[PDB]
Amino acid sequence: QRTAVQGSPTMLAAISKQWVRGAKVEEDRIHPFRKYFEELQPGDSLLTPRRTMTEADIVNFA
Amino acid sequence: QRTAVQGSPTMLAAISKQWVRGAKVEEDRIHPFRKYFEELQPGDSLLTPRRTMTEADIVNFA
């Protein structure tokens, strides 16, 4: 049976057992790549540091 | 016999059978480096695209 489910993205993430855009995340101060398959959960999240783009980056990449 | 030939560059190119500065050119929408010797004519010309110089280029080349 095909069923459309409406709600907030966190509710839809819990219903789907998959993270969706705009759903609550969880941060762990362990990088997600260091976790084994069983230790990972949908919604485990990492905010990286920043990188400022330069004209030098355009030149070097091209 | 040595002869001085005065005229427009285009006339001098046609007389010389060599292209000279300021003479009419022919653009062909096929890159000139793809033509065999016999297909090439003096005056076959290509305008390339542009490249903007940057401080990064000075640094990288130095």
Curated annotation (Swiss-Prot), chains A, B:
Mutant lacking the gene: phenotype: Disruption causes the conversion of phenylacetate (PA) into 2-hydroxyphenylacetate (2-HPA).
Source domain of life: Bacteria
Induction / repression: Activated by cAMP receptor protein (CRP) and integration host factor (IHF). Inhibited by PaaX.
Family named by the database record: In the N-terminal section; belongs to the aldehyde dehydrogenase family.
Function, in words: Catalyzes the hydrolytic ring cleavage of 2-oxepin-2(3H)-ylideneacetyl-CoA (oxepin-CoA) via the open-chain aldehyde intermediate to yield 3-oxo-5,6-dehydrosuberyl-CoA. The enzyme consists of a C-terminal (R)-specific enoyl-CoA hydratase domain (formerly MaoC) that cleaves the ring and produces the highly reactive 3-oxo-5,6-dehydrosuberyl-CoA semialdehyde and an N-terminal NADP-dependent aldehyde dehydrogenase domain that oxidizes the aldehyde to 3-oxo-5,6-dehydrosuberyl-CoA. Can also use crotonyl-CoA as substrate.
Protein known as: Bifunctional protein PaaZ
Organism: Escherichia coli (strain K12)
Residues of the full protein shown: 495 to 556 of 681
